[PDB]
Amino acid sequence: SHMCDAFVGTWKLVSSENFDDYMKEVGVGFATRKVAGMAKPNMIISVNGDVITIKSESTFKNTEISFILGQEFDEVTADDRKVKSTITLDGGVLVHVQKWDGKSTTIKRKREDDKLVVECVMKGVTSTRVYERA
């Protein structure tokens, strides 16, 4: 057992709040927001040694990132930003910071009861997205 055990698995989106406004804050254009906001992604989290992989699959886009905690990587986000990302574990919360064009946004993933809760923040705009096991 180990570092991310309680996050590993296949998760499905069950609710979202304020995601359109979060995406507006990030700078996402109208048509991408509409199609992305309609998506119902499955998130697939796995661990092999020290390497964590997070996949997000939907009709909008399929993404995959692999990383080592605390070790920066370059990521092309689903909305086509080129960002410098670092993911760390802080008190049992996976904290994903993206840096680009002098801006920053943070995506936190938390296990709460039987759910996996995703909190996306930029400036004062937050979105909360709740996933359940698939």
Ligand X SMILES: O=C(O)c1csc(COc2cccc3cc[nH]c23)n1
- Contact yes or no for 115/132 (Cβ under 8 A): yes
111 is in an annotated binding site: no
Stretch that binds ligand X, among 2-10, 44-52, 71-79, 83-91 (CB under 6 A): 71-79
**Residue 122 lies near ligand X (rule: CB under 6 A):** no
- For 115-128, the DSSP string reads EEEEEEEETTEEEE
Write the single-letter amino acid at 20: D
**Residue 28 lies near ligand X (rule: CB under 6 A):** yes
**Residue 78 lies near ligand X (rule: CB under 6 A):** yes
Nearer to ligand X, 4 or 43 (CB): 43
129 is in an annotated binding site: yes
Q: Which of 47, 31, 13 is nearest to 127 (CA)?
A: 13
Stretch that binds ligand X, among 35-43, 45-53, 66-74, 84-92 (CB under 6 A): 35-43
**Residue 4 lies near ligand X (rule: CB under 6 A):** no
Q: Out of 24, 42, 79, 108, name the contact with ligand X by CB under 6 A.
A: 79
130 is in an annotated binding site: yes
Lookup result for tokens 């390497």: 51
Q: Which of 36, 80, 77 is nearest to 59 (CA)?
A: 36
Report how far residue 81's alpha carbon sits from residue 109's, in angstroms, rounded to the nearest whole number: 20
- Annotated binding-site ranges for a fatty acid: 129-131
- Annotated binding-site ranges: 129-131
